[PDB]
A paper describes a structure:
Upon engagement with AcrA’s α-helical hairpin domain, TolC helices rotate outward in a left-handed (counterclockwise) manner to open the channel, and enables small-molecule substrates to be exported through the fully assembled complex. These helices pivot around the equatorial domain, undergoing a 27° rigid-body superhelical rotation ([Fig fig3]), which constitutes a major structural rearrangement. This persistent interaction suggests that YbjP serves as a structural scaffold: anchoring TolC in the outer membrane, accommodating conformational changes during activation, and functionally compensating for TolC’s lack of intrinsic lipidation.
It comprises the inner membrane RND (Resistance–Nodulation– Division) transporter AcrB, the periplasmic membrane fusion protein AcrA, and the outer membrane channel TolC. Structural analysis reveals that YbjP, a previously uncharacterized lipoprotein, binds TolC in a 3:3 stoichiometry, bridging its protomers at the equatorial domain.
Author numbering:
A (entry chain C1), C (entry chain C2), D (entry chain C3): 23 to 454
B (entry chain P2), E (entry chain P3), F (entry chain P1): 19 to 170
Write the structure that this text describes.
């Protein structure tokens, strides 16, 4: 399993991008609900009411049952259109947030993948350190048994051996935790991963910070989100200001009513004013409403919206400054990493020379096995440091590409050419 | 009227056969199959395991270490099959950006209930069951979920 | 003051748990407000209106005073029942949050209590180092005074002494800040705590990770909260779908009215059509309402609720993965802590052997007082490290118990058996 | 450019205090909207409706056009006054938040200003170290070429030189990042900054912690904000309890109506009951409404408000405890800073004495150039540490001033008297 | 109608006697007692002081270090007793999950005011005084609150 | 009726002459002047440049390094002058606590358009131009904003 397959699996089963996608879908679906008031509304409603007279209308009772089908529809109301536009802009900013989440997922899976290799190298170094320290302790015990040193030296050697045993346990647990983090981020267990290739790995100079700034000015996700938020704030100003405008609706209604009268007074000489009525009305009409002075209300709302727009502009400026600073820092990090890579490579060469010196002396007869074991420990430490620096450089490339807002799986595909050989991640298998 | 555009593109790569669809529908069908045939054999359940529960269960059976787990029951918190099952309700699923949907199933033996929980994933174009987490007192054996129980 | 009494005092007076309890009580009280609309609603309302006619109704004036007592009650409206169920589920999740707050309070008080002891040990070691360094500086000054070394050695010794003095001041301030944090947690000042017992302290192997995972599956608080949130999301789906159904209300009213007429046209030949009326009604009625197509509205709301349910399911899956990772990490943490304890114990033994050798050499005549002082300093450092490791092991046991969502004072009772010897906390009393 | 001008420029153009100022202004402006419902509300509305009869009213059609002007005004409604008071208190707490933002801006600009000087000192030390290490490597290469050492020593020297080169690159990037952070805070590029003056710098013991606590109790911003929040909670209790009171409104209206009848039965023997009417009404009236039992409603809301008040009181107590702990910590921090300043000064003196010894030995003829180069490197390291400690002491003084809530530019004026000599901040200038 | 079950169980362990109850009520009673008499003694104020203020003030009196503070006015920000007091209202306390209730009592001497602050705690079943925060300009002496003033 | 008191006090120190005011208004008059006279000279544009773009541009011209940038166009993302300009509206600015207002200016040449962006700052009592950030594809030259293009 290399980085490409790991990321392909992670993109599928990861319960952090699915939630953002669902939130995006809900925000996009809200457009229909925002547009719903514009569409015609209609309903049906029936009722039945019995009334009993009192005082002057003594002995008068009525029973009226009504059923009305109503259909209302607006004609000119800018508030609904403004709300629809606001919902559209909110959906856009939510989509921008989802894109940002995708970029963070890519970065997270890359970092979690490289942590496992770093832990593997650390454990491999710790195993050699343990072997060398155990041989040193055995040497000290032999010298004491023959008799050349005091008991304090033996106690110190045993203390150092116990310390290295604890360090080995800590490194093993670190590897286990790294594998568990990878499983948490991918929802799968990986028993073997692709490791770095020494020959295929080359470090290239980054493009000038001027081009980086030029691309990040117009392609960064945070800047686009801030600009869209400012546009939404302006639309909010306009929607709040639209409270001065009048409104106009049209209604239609078909109503059927059935009324019956009873009581002592009705059962008399009323003749025509007290009779059961079977009424039917197909009411159709318009309605116009123009609000006038309502205290502060709309004026205060406009002032508040203007202040909110000012705040949004300040947020946009702050976002631009932060983006510029982030781009500059991420550009400097790459050069720092290149220098660190060169230094660690030279240190590895020196450690190899020292190990060869110890081996030659041991073969000739001027050295012991403990010396070559310590040289091997130092060489392993240098190798681990160099590998960690290389992984840091590879991560810094992705950080540079993410600062510009142009991170996608093509970068991972390009990076995948440096991972060639498989290595197991079982702590017992790598170091029994 | 507008229609939402699904965030994801494929959400697929399904190998084995699978049932029509519906998360609660698929879980209820699985439990009905379990109750109807009292064999609880793995190979007849293949259209219900996803792509990895099948191979994990096959390798566990061939490993000759989890015989007692497999014989009694692998898919429930109790060694004996239940009398009735009621899978929780999920009111449909829009588009295709939906995985890892767990449902709390309520299983009833003779005046008993354990309320297990099953995972469900899409993995292609249908709905499929995965994991199962033994969410009941007096757990059958091993630990936690079935995958944690049979993983090495 | 051992751990149990400190925890009891902290539970009694802590302005972080009281706010959580108040929020829980408010959430539980909201059930009554949510259920109130189901209960009958009655009111009383009176008014008086004077009307003056115009145009065709010239010289016509009316004065009408009305007073009505109304009582309304909803017969069938399941939206209110769904809201009541939603409020109940919210109260349940708030209670789960309160339980989590209790657990974190226990963890915090234990951590502070052990931090104070660690600070005490560090201060003791620092003052031992101060004594050794001062004796070394005096030795160097004497050697220069008789004349055996250059002035640079004296300057270096004075620099070491000043650095040690600054370190002592820093350690004293650290102890003071630890006591201040304990007071902040518990709202009380403790000039006396209980120290660890070395004879009664033993390290026991933890239970297998499988049993821990099995317990944490069904017993963890975060998992329960996520499951309850998913259930609430399902209830929200049902509440959104409830909008399709019709509604039915029952109304009753008792009203009195008194109307009088005046004006030029009133004082005419109307006779029976323009007179003062003392009218009274006892109305009882039923109302039924069936909403029909309203644009998207309810359909879009149902889709939004379904998307929210999908998001809640994603949250549940993420919570389960995080819980599993946390339990595994804590198990590995305690496993490493055991080995750290063993290594530090061996280091303490070696340091004691070195100190005994130095003391024997000083007694015989081959060593000076500075050598045994440095040996004592090293022994004190080893003792402090071992004690800190023991406190870390106890805190890791508490973390193991907390990850399963089963933390309570019964674990503090078990920890209390290892705290026997009282110790003062005043910096001057323990470190003159 | 000293600290004062930098702070003035930062206060002028900082896109994080303007946002808070705009938010505070919006909160203050919302008072008008809150008071708006109290003021009279008047409007104008017209409509036109055509009705067609059915069933018993067959062949009856009507056309009615109405136009009304309405003016309503609440005579007694305590809820609006309660809302106005609530808005006022919210504006007050927002103003307190703005003051806190001003204080944190002052602190941030001070820290970012001192970071640049620290970076300059580190870069100078690294340049000296690079010179010394290069000379050592050249000496080793000369020794090998003549033939005195093995190749392993040459490899080790080259490795150390490469490590020093990487360290120099890192220090240069750190200085660049510090300058970029200053630019982000202040929105300007500063190519020259006033450096610390050692003649005018002195350390003074602070006032006793008792006086600090006495001032901070009645002057801290967080405590005032918490107290105002508790008062707002009490006002919320009263506003919720105000639901029992009745309400009184005054209404006036002037309306005209034109109605016409036609269709069939109108053109009959009705005579006057079926005729076009031109109605005009000048209506004036009152409206009294007294709510009665509404289920739980107001009682449950009162209980909820009381629970919220309890929570606010708990928050106030927690804030007081945190303030006390912060003041104590700051006092101890400044004491430790002075104690560390003394030790670093002594270390600088010792390093200077060692360098003078090395230089005298080199002049006489007992030492090489590499020895005096290493002595200069050590002296530079000590100088950098002392300067960093001095900057930390100044920042601690500012922190103590801020903990009391009395931070303003007058303290920056006092700090400015210790910054006299300007230094360029170009990495190429300070270290080609 | 349902009720709310209190989160806590005991919230007690009270030793000395106390006034009936009511935070604002108890504060008003304390400030009425302090003005009705003009002695400002400690032993007769035990029902109001809770459990730690009483012993702390007794030890402070026996210490003979805070005589000047204990004489003039330990419970107020001014060395002289006020002409009138008005304790901020608090409309009842539901159930028993409520401690640390701070109140800003408004005191008034001759054409002056300081608006000090006091604390209410339950400690059993009554309400009792704590701290007193000295929230007036030109405070009496020492520092901050009474406890910070007299603690060692 | 009440009024809001501005949080700031000075927001000033303007040296050079400046136009009446209005952020969108000033940004529109700047483009109107630039199209009206096809010279595009920095000496007569001083009322629009704020206080630092003026000196920065003067020193860039005197530096003899940015000849190509200063020749074609320094204030737009395209090497040639636009055909029409439209400044994004801002419905007035209350009081005086407002600077750093960015406006997305929509330029249109022959059947094209790139939608640059400018900055409005107060610096005294009026509104003046700043930055200009080249927010369009196929950027003219250098990098990002004009200030980053001409800074050292």
């Amino acid at each position: 399993e290399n980085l490409m397959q790991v990321y392909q699996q992670a993109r599928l089963s990861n319960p952090e991008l699915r939630k953002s996608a669902a939130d995006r879908d809900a925000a996009f679906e809200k457009i229909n609900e925002a547009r719903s008031p514009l569409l015609p509304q209609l309903g049906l409603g029936a009722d039945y009411t019995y009334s009993n007279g009192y005082r002057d209308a003594n002995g008068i009772n009525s029973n009226a049952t009504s059923a009305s089908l109503q259909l209302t529809q607006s004609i000119f109301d800018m508030s609904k259109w403004r709300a629809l536009t606001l919902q559209e802009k909110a959906a856009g900013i939510q989509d921008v947030t989802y894109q940002t989440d995708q970029q963070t997922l890519i970065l997270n899976t890359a970092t979690a993948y490289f942590n496992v290799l770093n832990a593997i190298d650390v454990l491999s170094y710790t195993q050699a350190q343990k072997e060398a320290i155990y041989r040193q302790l055995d040497q000290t015990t032999q010298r004491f048994n023959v008799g050349l040193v005091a008991i304090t030296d033996v106690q110190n050697a045993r203390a150092q051996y116990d310390t290295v045993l604890a360090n080995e346990v800590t490194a093993r647990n670190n590897l286990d935790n790294a594998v568990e983090q990878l499983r948490q981020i991918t929802g799968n267990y990986y028993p073997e991963l692709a490791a770095l290739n020494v020959e295929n790995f080359k470090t290239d100079k980054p493009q000038p910070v001027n081009a980086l700034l030029k691309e990040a000015e117009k392609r960064n996700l945070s800047l686009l989100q801030a600009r869209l938020s400012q546009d939404l704030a302006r639309e909010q100003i306009r929607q709040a200001q639209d409270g001065h405008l009048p409104t106009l609706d049209l209604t239609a209604s078909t109503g059927i009513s059935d009324t019956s009268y009873s009581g002592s007074k009705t059962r008399g000489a009323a003749g025509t004013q007290y009779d059961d009525s079977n009424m039917g009305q197909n009411k159709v009409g318009l309605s116009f409403s123009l609000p006038i002075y309502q205290g502060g209300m709309v004026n205060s709302q406009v002032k508040q919206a203007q202040y909110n727009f000012v705040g949004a502009s300040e947020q946009l400026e702050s976002a631009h400054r932060s983006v510029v600073q982030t781009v500059r820092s991420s550009f400097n990090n790459i050069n720092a990493s290149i220098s660190s890579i060169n230094a660690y490579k030279q240190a590895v060469v020196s450690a190899q020379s020292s190990l060869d010196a110890m081996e030659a002396g041991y073969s000739v007869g001027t050295r012991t096995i403990v010396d070559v074991l310590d040289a091997t420990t130092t060489l392993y430490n240098a190798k681990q440091e160099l590998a960690n620096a290389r992984y840091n450089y590879l991560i810094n490339q992705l950080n540079i590409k993410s600062a510009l807002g142009t991170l996608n799986e093509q970068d991972l595909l390009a990076l995948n050419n440096a991972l060639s050989k498989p290595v197991s991640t079982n702590p017992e298998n790598v170091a029994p | 009227c507008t229609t939402v555009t699904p965030a994801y593109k494929d959400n697929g790569t399904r190998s084995g056969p699978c049932v029509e669809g519906g998360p609660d529908n698929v879980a209820q069908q699985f439990y009905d199959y379990r109750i109807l045939h009292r064999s609880n054999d793995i190979t007849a359940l293949r259209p219900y395991l996803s792509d990895k529960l099948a191979t994990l269960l096959s390798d566990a059976s061939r490993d000759n270490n989890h015989r007692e787990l497999l014989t009694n029951d692998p898919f429930s918190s109790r060694t004996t099959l239940p009398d009735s099952a009621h899978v929780a309700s999920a009111s449909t699923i829009p588009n295709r950006d939906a995985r890892n949907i767990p449902l709390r199933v309520d299983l009833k033996q003779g005046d008993q209930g354990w309320q297990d929980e099953v995972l469900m994933i899409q993995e292609g174009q249908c709905w499929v069951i995965d994991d199962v987490r033994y969410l009941g007192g007096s757990v059958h054996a091993t630990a936690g979920t079935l995958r944690q129980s049979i993983e090495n």
